[PDB]
Amino acid sequence: AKRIDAALIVKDGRVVEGSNFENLRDSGDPVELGKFYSEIGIDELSFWDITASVEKRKTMLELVEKVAEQIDIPFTVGGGIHDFETASELILRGADKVEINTAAVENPSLITQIAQTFGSQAVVVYIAAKRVDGEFMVFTYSGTKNTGILLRDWVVEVEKRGAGEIVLGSIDRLGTKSGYDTEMIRFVRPLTTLPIIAHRGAGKMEHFLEAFLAGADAAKADSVFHFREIDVRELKEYLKKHGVNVRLEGLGSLEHHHHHH
Amino acid sequence: LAKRIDAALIVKDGRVVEGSNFENLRDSGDPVELGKFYSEIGIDELSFWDITASVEKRKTMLELVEKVAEQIDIPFTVGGGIHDFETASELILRGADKVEINTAAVENPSLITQIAQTFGSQAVVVYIAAKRVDGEFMVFTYSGTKNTGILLRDWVVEVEKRGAGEIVLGSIDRLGTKSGYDTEMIRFVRPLTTLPIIAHRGAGKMEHFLEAFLAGADAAKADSVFHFREIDVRELKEYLKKHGVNVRL
């Protein structure tokens, strides 16, 4: 059952670089945009906060509270979640799950803490990996620091520690539009039973097919959606046409059988 | 207040599955003659539910609605694995008053809206096959075979929202039974929708119909109980009228 997720980069309650959806009242509003995606075919949402100010904690708490009120699809919260306290806060305020990265690499017991308390399904681990001298290596601090940890070991450990899902983002595909890193997805696939979520590289609908053929369970994208390079309904219909098990329930939820001229 | 009595014919390869007990007819297995006979003795609407398997399904169903539309003058629905707008569209333009959809609509509720968008809500019937599971009514697809995990109460609301004209509410918990319509299920659904609600499965005797209407049903559908002459359609209409049910006579 392949999943299509939309990720929103958010800063001080705003979608960073907004979106091209004219129909919205405010195309930089995270909650409105997010509700929109939920009503046109997105399976799950991610909100990633990069608010650098002192206000970050409450800013993120306020985001998930608004989002849980307005939206009925599963969503993930992430950004700079660094301990159990803030992770607990965010889940309790409404987050179906939290997306952790650097804090997990620094302290893998953190995966286990959250999972033991809120269930493993509330724990998503984002893995930023990059080819370094012929090996997949794990990077932290916004894909800047090489931890010296191999991808193949970090994957095994993350499942061991009790994560529900792994988001697998290729630094080697950052900024690009030539496709998901299907090599990296095929590498990781035999190493875990967890849901693998692909990120970075997506540029056209066929990229999503390739990702799923590689064995991804879900595929995340952001600007390709926000900027409408790919229409979500079009994407879902394309996948289904070529035999991919995708959910169509969410399609056309905003449309009606009347005609408003 | 006005209550409706429908007969449903299960057909396969142009033939009535397990036929009927109407010796008068020149062919008790012929859907057109059986349906025509039903139309004269007082049935208000017909459903033809095709289970044709092998690759002729699409063509078979179209020949069927063509024949039916020619001989019969009461409304009818056609249904049985109708999976997209184009199919439904052909069938209506070929003479069906209404198309019924189920599994296709559950997986793709937009199908409801597309059809209604063109032909109007009254052209769209949605069949909801439901069963109790762990204390909740659940929606089942693929001929009652797949537990979708979708709650009946959520699906009923969505079905109206999307633009269906009426809901055939078929209880899998009464499948093949004769002890009566699922009036508990019918009562559960009644305040969830403004749409005509049509009861299916459970009917064994005439009183069962009265019960269903008391439960808030707007129409009752039955099949084998009519075909095998356990209930007579005219006697049914007379009974209901007698105890105050606004049926057509």
Q: Any chance you could write out the topology, listing elements then pairs?
A:
Two copies of one chain form a homodimer.
Chain A lengths: L2 E9 L2 E2 L14 H9 L5 E6 L6 H15 L4 E4 L5 H9 L4 E4 L1 H5 L2 H10 L4 E9 L4 E5 L4 E6 H11 L3 E6 L11 H7 L7 E4 L5 H9 L4 E4 L1 H4 L5 H10 L20
Parallel strand pairs in A: 1-3, 1-11, 3-4, 4-5, 5-6, 6-9, 9-10, 10-11
Antiparallel strand pairs in A: 1-2, 6-7, 7-8
Helix pairs in contact in A: 1-2, 2-3, 3-5, 8-10
- Output the radius of gyration of chain A: 18 Å
- What is the strand content of chain A? 15-25%
Q: Helix-strand pattern of chain A, N to C?
A: EEHEHEHEHHEEEHEHEHEHH
Most extensive interface, chain pair and sizes: A-B, 9 and 12 residues
For the secondary structure, the number of strands of chain A is 11
Query: For the largest beta sheet of chain A, what order do the strands appear in spatially?
Result: 1-3-4-5-6-9-10-11
Q: Which class best fits the helix and strand makeup of chain A? A: alpha/beta
* CA-CA gap between termini of chain A: 38 Å
CATH fold name of chain A, please? TIM Barrel
Shape of chain A: globular
> At CATH's second level, what is the architecture of chain A?
Alpha-Beta Barrel
Assembly category:
homodimer
CATH first level of chain A: Alpha Beta
Helix content of chain A: 25-40%
Question: Can you count the helices of chain A?
Answer: 10
CATH superfamily grouping of chain A? Aldolase class I
